[PDB]
Design an enzyme around this catalytic site. Structure first.
Site, short mmCIF file in Angstrom:
data_model
loop_
_atom_site.label_atom_id
_atom_site.label_comp_id
_atom_site.label_asym_id
_atom_site.label_seq_id
_atom_site.Cartn_x
_atom_site.Cartn_y
_atom_site.Cartn_z
N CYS A 130 0.77 -1.20 0.00
CA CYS A 130 0.00 0.00 0.00
C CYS A 130 0.82 1.26 0.00
O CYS A 130 1.35 1.69 1.03
CB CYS A 130 -1.06 -0.01 1.17
SG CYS A 130 -1.98 1.55 1.22
N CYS A 133 -0.31 4.25 2.16
CA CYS A 133 -0.11 3.92 3.57
C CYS A 133 1.33 4.13 3.96
O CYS A 133 1.62 4.72 5.02
CB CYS A 133 -0.48 2.45 3.85
SG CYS A 133 -2.13 1.93 3.30
N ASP A 134 2.25 3.69 3.10
CA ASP A 134 3.63 3.48 3.49
C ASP A 134 4.66 4.32 2.78
O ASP A 134 5.82 4.45 3.25
CB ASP A 134 3.94 2.00 3.31
CG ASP A 134 3.23 1.15 4.29
OD1 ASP A 134 2.95 1.69 5.38
OD2 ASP A 134 2.91 -0.03 4.03
#
Ligand SMILES: Cc1cc2nc3c(=O)[nH]c(=O)nc-3n(C[C@H](O)[C@H](O)[C@H](O)COP(=O)(O)OP(=O)(O)OC[C@H]3O[C@@H](n4cnc5c(N)ncnc54)[C@H](O)[C@@H]3O)c2cc1C
Ligand SMILES: Cc1cc2nc3c(=O)[nH]c(=O)nc-3n(C[C@H](O)[C@H](O)[C@H](O)COP(=O)(O)OP(=O)(O)OC[C@H]3O[C@@H](n4cnc5c(N)ncnc54)[C@H](O)[C@@H]3O)c2cc1C
Ligand SMILES: NC(=O)c1ccc[n+]([C@@H]2O[C@H](COP(=O)([O-])OP(=O)(O)OC[C@H]3O[C@@H](n4cnc5c(N)ncnc54)[C@H](OP(=O)(O)O)[C@@H]3O)[C@@H](O)[C@H]2O)c1
Ligand SMILES: NC(=O)c1ccc[n+]([C@@H]2O[C@H](COP(=O)([O-])OP(=O)(O)OC[C@H]3O[C@@H](n4cnc5c(N)ncnc54)[C@H](OP(=O)(O)O)[C@@H]3O)[C@@H](O)[C@H]2O)c1
Lengths: 303, 303
Positions: A130, A133-134
């Site tokens: 993701c 997300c990251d």
């Protein structure tokens, strides 16, 4: 006791729930996490008609907004099973049971794993599925993206905000992604390609990823190259474990429906990414959801 | 010469065109009028996921916005016919011909007529099929709305902004409209009902409507009542005259497709309201459009 229970509050479920609530069906919308489904794992959405470009989590909030005012009952739940009792159905979560005349399964799909060494070991520490997300954990790294579809290529373009370079490793010499996205990746100076290649091993120190071994699928040539992160986009698997017994899934685990979103089982419908189908988009999620909602209304009316 | 020509720029066509252009297909979008289709004849849209409530013409503009930047060629055209020449197709408008490998027919549906006396005579002068177009001409009038579906009931609620009263005349004792809309109409003090009734004659002075004669469908009782305007919402007919010869329509004139938007004729698809189907909404228009766009891409790739 419920007219309809919708399982999953991504765009298909949320559309279904809006439609059933507008038909004044006693509506429960169960979601294990945050409303939005995959849209919350999406950076920029450009192809949802009505919006020129919108961040995934914002579109998620906009779709969720009206639901409570329409009288949808929004509830936390991880569904573990469904029993067909003929003229009603039971839904089992971790702690609850819900009885309903109809069910619309809108639980979507999950990232496929590579199933290579290092992939589990470096889960918290260099391996990601993701980018929104990251990505920011990888500022100034050499990032690797695995896959040649829409997700791989879009998420690689997003990640160029953070990485020194982003390399897309694809197992053929032609991407699957939409041409407009391919073209943007071809032109972007911070995107490199490793064509005709698959990852064989993710390697690191006992703290974080350092390198990836891969192989060329036409020659067998093996290369190892240093990277600071790897994002994996090699396709999807169905999120349908709670119906595996029921006889409504294909050999890969996707829910089989007809064109009115109906399964084998009367009063159980399925919509969106969880269904057996080829084209997974927000547009077809929303479409499926509306259709199932209308089919559930008619089913319940007739019952 | 075109990879795809999409006929009609309502939400189905506009979604299709966005998707084909993003696949870098040489895309022509023909529209006889204003982009938006029926959405421009819609006052408030509450059930398009992503928007809590939005005026129809605004949603139309938002859907049209990105198309030109994606390289869709937007052009004026009234299509009068289509010829299948095997490995290409020709599209005839009033003044032009276009050759294309594929076609996506997105021309929607039109208001059904009552086919009663006075209906044509008072067309410009009391009889209307569009409340957002005409409502303000009827300020302080006793307005009549014919029909019991979503359009009749929503458009009656809109018209209460203008009329002294709005009466909904329906041919049964139960509305077809979504229950949430039924309920809003039941509660609205300026909405009256004439249940179990059909209009027989629209009457007026040689300048404008003055009264309507109607009949009760359970008793044959005939009543005449004064009204200053009548808005008619008794369902839809297909807008598909340009393919009547081609063998892709049902007995009522709707375009028959399979679940991938395909007609009989390879490379001719149809989407949205023009198709044979039950559920006509913006959600399913957008869904159909995206699906056809992906099917046209594959068809053209294979050609
Ligand atoms: C990186 C990325 C970018 C994308 N970009 C786009 C794009 O730009 N345009 C586009 O059209 N499509 C895009 N997609 C595809 C789109 O996001 C999906 O098609 C769509 O979200 C599917 O919606 P859905 O409601 O079927 O499933 P999902 O959005 O997957 O929602 C399923 C929901 O079910 C919940 N759930 C699952 N199991 C359970 C359980 N057992 N109990 C309770 N709840 C459960 C989940 O938490 C989730 O919230 C993208 C996908 C990805 C991964
Ligand atoms: C009063 C009203 C309120 C509504 N409210 C809602 C709502 O709130 N929510 C909702 O989901 N749905 C609503 N609908 C339904 C929704 O508007 C339709 O389902 C949807 O617009 C269908 O889109 P489409 O693209 O298939 O057809 P259309 O929007 O009908 O677009 C067809 C296009 O084709 C063009 N065209 C036709 N013939 C030709 C030709 N020969 N050559 C060139 N161009 C041509 C037309 O000009 C038109 O622009 C409403 C409908 C009405 C009438
Ligand atoms: N903008 C959007 O509309 C949008 C954005 C994201 C996703 N989506 C949709 O969501 C669905 C899933 O998309 P996705 O991109 O996640 O999955 P996907 O369409 O299945 O694509 C996966 C890609 O990874 C490749 N691959 C698989 N295994 C590999 C390996 N071991 N090494 C290297 N490459 C490998 C596949 O190769 P092959 O091509 O050889 O199979 C394919 O190109 C699609 O239907 C997609 O269109 C849409
Ligand atoms: N908000 C939305 O999502 C929205 C808004 C508008 C329209 N739409 C959709 O667009 C499609 C068309 O909607 P619609 O309302 O225009 O048409 P529709 O669904 O066909 O409804 C027509 C209504 O008029 C009635 N009727 C027919 N002839 C009559 C007569 N001679 N006298 C009195 N009443 C008569 C019908 O009766 P019977 O019921 O007996 O057949 C029906 O109730 C639908 O699928 C609808 O859901 C959706």
């Amino acid at each position: 006791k419920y007219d309809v229970v919708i399982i999953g509050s991504g765009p298909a479920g949320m559309t279904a729930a809006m439609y059933t609530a507008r038909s004044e069906m006693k509506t429960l919308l169960l979601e294990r996490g945050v409303p939005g489904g995959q849209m919350n794992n999406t950076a920029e959405i450009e192809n949802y008609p009505g919006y020129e470009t919108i961040m995934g989590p914002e579109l998620s909030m906009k779709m969720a907004e009206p639901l409570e005012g329409l009288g949808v009952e929004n509830a936390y739940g991880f569904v573990t099973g469904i029993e067909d009792h003929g003229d009603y159905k039971k839904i089992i979560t971790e702690d609850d049971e819900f009885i309903t005349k109809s069910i619309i399964i809108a639980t979507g799909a999950n990232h496929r794993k590579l199933e290579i060494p290092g992939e589990e070991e470096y889960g918290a520490r260099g391996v990601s599925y993701c980018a929104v997300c990251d990505g920011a954990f990888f500022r100034n790294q050499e990032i690797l993206v695995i896959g040649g579809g829409d997700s791989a290529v879009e998420e690689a373009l997003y990640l160029t905000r953070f990485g020194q370079s982003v390399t897309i490793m694809h197992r053929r010499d032609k991407l699957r992604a939409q041409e407009i996205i391919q073209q943007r990746a071809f032109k972007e100076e911070k995107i490199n390609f490793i064509w005709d290649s698959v990852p064989m091993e993710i390697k690191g120190d006992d703290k974080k990823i350092q390198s990836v071994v891969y192989k060329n699928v036409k020659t067998g040539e093996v290369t190892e190259k240093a990277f600071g992160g790897i994002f994996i986009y090699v396709g999807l698997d169905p999120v349908a474990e709670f119906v595996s017994d029921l006889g409504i899934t294909d050999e890969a685990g996707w829910i089989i429906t007809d064109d009115h979103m109906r399964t084998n089982i009367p009063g159980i419908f399925a919509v969106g990414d969880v269904r057996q189908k080829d084209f997974r988009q927000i547009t077809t999620a929303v479409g499926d959801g509306a259709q199932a909602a209308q089919e559930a209304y008619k089913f319940v009316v007739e019952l």
